[PDB]
């Protein structure tokens, strides 16, 4: 599910032409170089979510803390109800999109 060499827009088009609703990938962050970002498709559209790396754990700038990016991705894959945005709408990591 990690795509080392793509931008946010490329991630969008990848998810829209090779994924389904619930597909996601992780990629490096344009705005926070060196960090990572989740791109997630839902209801035919793609949103993006910054991942924080403090050097002691990974998280989504809030929520549970993880030792590795993979543990983070695995956790939200297994806990579809946990990524609620302020709107109240859930965003579900369902199907990793391979490279």
């Amino acid at each position: 599910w990690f795509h080392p060499n793509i931008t946010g827009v490329e991630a969008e088009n990848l998810l829209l032409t090779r994924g389904v609703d619930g597909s996601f990938l992780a990629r490096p962050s344009k705005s926070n170089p060196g960090d990572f970002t989740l791109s997630v498709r839902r209801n035919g559209a793609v949103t993006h979510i910054k991942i924080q790396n403090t050097g002691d754990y990974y998280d989504l700038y809030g929520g549970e803390k993880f030792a590795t990016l993979a543990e983070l991705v695995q956790y939200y894959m297994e806990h579809h109800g946990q990524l609620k945005e302020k709107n109240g709408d859930v965003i579900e990591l369902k199907y990793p999109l391979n490279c």
């Binding site: 705005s31 993006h48 979510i49 989504l60 946990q82 609620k84 945005e85 302020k86 109240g88 965003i91």
Partner: peptide, 9 residues
């Protein structure tokens, strides 16, 4: 520059 979500966690 793409859209980023504001999460309530």
């Amino acid at each position: 520059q793409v859209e980023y979500l504001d999460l309530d966690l």
